[PDB]
Structures are given as C-alpha cells and as structure tokens.
Design a protein around this ligand. Sequence first.
Ligand SMILES: CC(=O)N[C@H]1[C@H]([C@H](O)[C@H](O)CO)O[C@@](O[C@H]2[C@@H](O)[C@@H](CO)O[C@@H](O[C@H]3[C@H](O)[C@@H](O)[C@H](O)O[C@@H]3CO)[C@@H]2O)(C(=O)O)C[C@@H]1O
Ligand SMILES: [Cl-]
Ligand SMILES: [Cl-]
Ligand SMILES: [Cl-]
Length: 138
Amino acid sequence: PLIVPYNLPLPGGVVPRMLITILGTVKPNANRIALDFQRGNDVAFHFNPRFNENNRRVIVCNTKLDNNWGREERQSVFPFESGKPFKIQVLVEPDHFKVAVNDAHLLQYNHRVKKLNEISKLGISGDIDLTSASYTMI
Ligand SMILES: CC(=O)N[C@H]1[C@H]([C@H](O)[C@H](O)CO)O[C@@](O[C@H]2[C@@H](O)[C@@H](CO)O[C@@H](O[C@H]3[C@H](O)[C@@H](O)[C@H](O)O[C@@H]3CO)[C@@H]2O)(C(=O)O)C[C@@H]1O
Ligand SMILES: [Cl-]
Ligand SMILES: [Cl-]
Ligand SMILES: [Cl-]
C-alpha cells in the first residue's frame, strides 16, 4: 500500500504513448479524488471526481496557471462508487490526455499546457486507498 497524498515523478515529463495506471479503492463516504499533473506550481491537468456537488456526482477537469483556475470542463458520466476498487488509466496522446476507468473510455482533455516535457510530477490525493501507481510506454 502507498501513502496518500502520493507524488509520482515523471522523469523528463510526459510524452505521447506514455500510459499511467492508477489502482486503488474509493473509501466509504468519499467526497473527492484528484489527479494533478504539475508543471512546477502550475497544474497542467486536474482530474477531479466529486461525489457530492449539490447532491450530484460530477467529474471536473481544469488547468491552473499562475495560481488561477481556468474554465472548467465537466463530465456527468461517473464510473466511481464509494467502497469499490477502480483502475484509472491516463494515456498521453499528441493533442490530449485520454482517460479510461475500469477499461472503459471516459473523457479526453485537450492540452492547454503545451510544454509536455515540463509536466514532470503527478499528485494523487483524495478519499482513496492507493494500491499502485506506475507508468509504461505503449
Ligand atoms: C488547502 C485546500 O483545501 N485547498 C483546496 C483549494 C481551496 O479550497 C481553494 O482556495 C478554494 O477555496 O481548492 C482546490 O480545489 C479546487 C479545484 O478543484 C477547482 C477546479 O476548477 O475547483 C475549485 O472549486 C471551484 C468550483 O468548481 C466552481 O464551481 C466555483 O465557481 O469556483 C470554485 C473555486 O474556484 C476547487 O476549490 C484546489 O485544488 O485549488 C482543492 C484544494 O484541496
Ligand atoms: Cl458513490
Ligand atoms: Cl491526440
Ligand atoms: Cl505551455
């Protein structure tokens, strides 16, 4: 088991065909999960499942530049469930991050931060037990 919040270095940044796989279990009565792909203090890609936003379940995606959040992209398809194991896979493609959960396509996020080689850390946080966090090239 791994300690949350967990920082996964991405040596030399991200590159197309890099696949990041996160395995864990959502805690009972969870409120949030967050994956933050960082470029220094900036957040290139914030992936943020929210279990209770005005009694709705929603995934919020955004970018933070110079301490300011941008325009949110929201997804109503919500594959997570409190108490249950999950697999998140983030595939870096030339023009977007592609996210699949439990082997099903979920969403894609167009690159707002364009210096991919400088996105060199992934932060994992929220109401989860974290089992594994790794990457490979496909
Ligand atoms: C230490 C700590 O708990 N930090 C939080 C911060 C702070 O709460 C922040 O200063 C706001 O008080 O917020 C963080 O989550 C934010 C992030 O998920 C962004 C993504 O867009 O959304 C923010 O909420 C939005 C909300 O989605 C909009 O509907 C609303 O109009 O504006 C809100 C504020 O911008 C989240 O607060 C953060 O990472 O900055 C979560 C940290 O845990
Ligand atoms: Cl739930
Ligand atoms: Cl692409
Ligand atoms: Cl950039």
